[PDB]
Amino acid sequence: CEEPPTFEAMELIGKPKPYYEIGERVDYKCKKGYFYIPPLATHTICDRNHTWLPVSDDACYRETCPYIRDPLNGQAVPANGTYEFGYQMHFICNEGYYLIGEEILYCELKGSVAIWSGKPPICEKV
Numbered sequence: 001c002e003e004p005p006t007f008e009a010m011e012l013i014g015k016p017k018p019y020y021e022i023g024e025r026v027d028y029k030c031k032k033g034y035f036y037i038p039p040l041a042t043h044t045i046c047d048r049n050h051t052w053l054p055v056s057d058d059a060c061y062r063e064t065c066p067y068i069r070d071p072l073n074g075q076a077v078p079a080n081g082t083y084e085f086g087y088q089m090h091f092i093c094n095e096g097y098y099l100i101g102e103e104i105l106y107c108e109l110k111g112s113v114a115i116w117s118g119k120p121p122i123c124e125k126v
């Protein structure tokens, strides 16, 4: 096999070789800001078809901004589904009930932690 994949959350351990013999195993690590969360794989092997076995960065977790209790009568559903930084929180209200706050709270880099965008919505009545 050639050089193992590159990921946005994982960094290969040891320096890249040009060629890897079949049955050779490479191991990765979470990049400076990440945290690994069991169980998922973070390594790979060079199979008999001289390709690497599938593997994902999707286990190395980037910090997270706190938790948001579903505003009574609307669920606090994430799109870009995750409470990690760099994404958003939206307050879709119930077919009818509209908002006293704002539809989307974006979670992102603040200092070292990551906090969402401002303060969350109230789901009132009509």
Ligand SMILES: *[C@@H]1O[C@H](CO)[C@@H](O[C@@H]2O[C@H](CO)[C@@H](O)[C@H](O[C@@H]3O[C@H](CO[C@H]4O[C@H](CO)[C@@H](O)[C@H](O[C@H]5O[C@H](CO)[C@@H](O)[C@H](O)[C@@H]5O[C@H]5O[C@H](CO)[C@@H](O)[C@H](O)[C@@H]5O)[C@@H]4O)[C@@H](O)[C@H](O[C@H]4O[C@H](CO)[C@@H](O)[C@H](O)[C@@H]4O[C@H]4O[C@H](CO)[C@@H](O)[C@H](O)[C@@H]4O)[C@@H]3O)[C@H]2NC(C)=O)[C@H](O)[C@H]1NC(C)=O
Pocket (backbone or CB within 6 Å): 049, 051
């Ligand atoms: C062991 O090692 C090998 C070594 O790499 C691995 O290789 C794979 O094997 C083949 C053979 O080399 C490669 O084709 C593949 O890389 C490309 O594959 C493309 C995917 O094919 C799709 O397009 C088809 C064309 O319409 C489409 O029908 C098809 O959908 C079906 O096929 C997929 C995969 O075959 C299948 O999973 C799916 O279920 C579908 O089912 C098909 O099969 C049925 C039975 O036959 C049939 O009934 C269905 O109708 C259906 O066909 C795929 O989605 C190839 O399309 C691509 O070929 C190029 O050439 C043509 C002709 O000139 C161009 O039109 C076309 O645009 C392609 O060129 C572009 O793409 C290349 C590559 O990105 C790019 O460089 C060019 O610039 C250009 O844009 C390639 O051959 C390899 N996959 C991988 C992951 O490497 C094996 O995986 C491995 N085995 C194992 C177990 O791991």
Ligand SMILES: *[C@@H]1O[C@H](CO)[C@@H](O[C@@H]2O[C@H](CO)[C@@H](O)[C@H](O[C@@H]3O[C@H](CO)[C@@H](O)[C@H](O[C@H]4O[C@H](CO)[C@@H](O)[C@H](O)[C@@H]4O)[C@@H]3O)[C@H]2NC(C)=O)[C@H](O)[C@H]1NC(C)=O
Pocket (backbone or CB within 6 Å): 079, 080
């Ligand atoms: C996080 O999830 C969000 C969903 O809740 C998402 O935010 C939205 O992104 C969607 C696109 O990914 C969009 O629905 C929305 O904006 C647009 O929707 C149009 C469809 O009606 C698209 O057409 C449009 O762009 C594309 O289409 C035109 C052709 O019609 C092309 O010309 C153009 O080049 C382009 O290809 C666009 O997608 C947007 N809404 C909000 C609040 O952002 C968000 O993207 C997800 N974030 C991540 C990081 O994935």
Ligand SMILES: [Ca+2]
Pocket (backbone or CB within 6 Å): 008, 057, 058
């Ligand atoms: Ca990812």
Ligand SMILES: [Cl-]
Pocket (backbone or CB within 6 Å): 040, 041, 042, 043
């Ligand atoms: Cl592992």
